[PDB]
Amino acid sequence: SIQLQLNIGVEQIRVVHRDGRVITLSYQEQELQDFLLSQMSQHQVHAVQQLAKVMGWQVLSFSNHVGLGPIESIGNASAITVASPSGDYAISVRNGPESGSKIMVQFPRNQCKDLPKSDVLQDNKWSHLRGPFKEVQWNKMEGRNFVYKMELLMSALSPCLL
């Protein structure tokens, strides 16, 4: 879902994007070298969305220029969050052209098992919804690509069907 038509003239560049948006670069190559990089920063989020459709899950939130967190330098960041079909677990992902790929997986309480059990919670109804996030480091994980890794993660959070 990212595709560019570039049109090179005599001292300008014209860029048309697959969703109705036109930009005009210049004869300096830093501009064009940063443009493509800022677009390679959004590909990952749209990749996770198009697979959250295919493989069953359901998206809860999507933004492709977020409005919180630190301040980026080349472009602007993107984030999503997407729920298990059984409903219990959830994934969330953030990416940026400068500081990218910060993924976190979120659990139902009574399976984090180091949680200070608050006092007002006495029932077992409130021990089925979900509160604790827990960050997972991207490195040292199976799958060569970023998209490929996601496949092995969003399949391991599924009921033990073996």
Partner 1 sequence: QYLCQPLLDAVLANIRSPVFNHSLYRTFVPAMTAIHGPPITSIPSVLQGEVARLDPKFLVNLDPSHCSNNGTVHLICKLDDKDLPSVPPLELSVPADYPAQSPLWIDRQWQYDANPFLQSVHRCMTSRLLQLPDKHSVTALLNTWAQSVHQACLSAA
Partner 2 sequence: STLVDELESSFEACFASLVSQDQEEIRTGVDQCIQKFLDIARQTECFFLQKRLQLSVQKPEQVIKEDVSELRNELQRKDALVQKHLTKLRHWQQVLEDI
Partner 3 sequence: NTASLCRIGQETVQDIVYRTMEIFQLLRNMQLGTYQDRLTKLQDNLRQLSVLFRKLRLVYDKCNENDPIPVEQLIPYVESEERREIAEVNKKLKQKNQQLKQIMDQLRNLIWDINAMLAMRN
The residue range among 4-12, 33-41, 107-115, 151-159 that interacts with partner 2, by the rule CB under 8 A, is 151-159
Residues within window 41-70 making contact with partner 2, judged by CB under 8 A:
55-56
51 lies in the binding site for partner 3 (CB under 8 A): no
Nearer to partner 1, 27 or 126 (CB): 126
Nearer to partner 1, 118 or 139 (CB): 118
98 lies in the binding site for partner 2 (CB under 8 A): no
Length of the chain: 162
Site map (CB under 8 A) of partner 1, residues 102-131, x = contact: --------------x-xxxx-x--x--x-x
142 lies in the binding site for partner 2 (CB under 8 A): yes
Minimum CB distance to partner 2, residue 42 (Å):
26
- DSSP per-residue codes, the chain: ---EEEEE-SS-EEEEETTTEEEEE-S-HHHHHHHHHHHHTTHHHHHHHHHHHHTS-EEEEEESS--SSS--SSS--EEEEEE-SSSS-EEEEEE-SSS----EEE--TTSS------SS--SSGGGSS---EEE--SSS-SSSSHHHHHHHHHHHTS----
Nearer to partner 1, 56 or 132 (CB): 132
152 lies in the binding site for partner 2 (CB under 8 A): yes
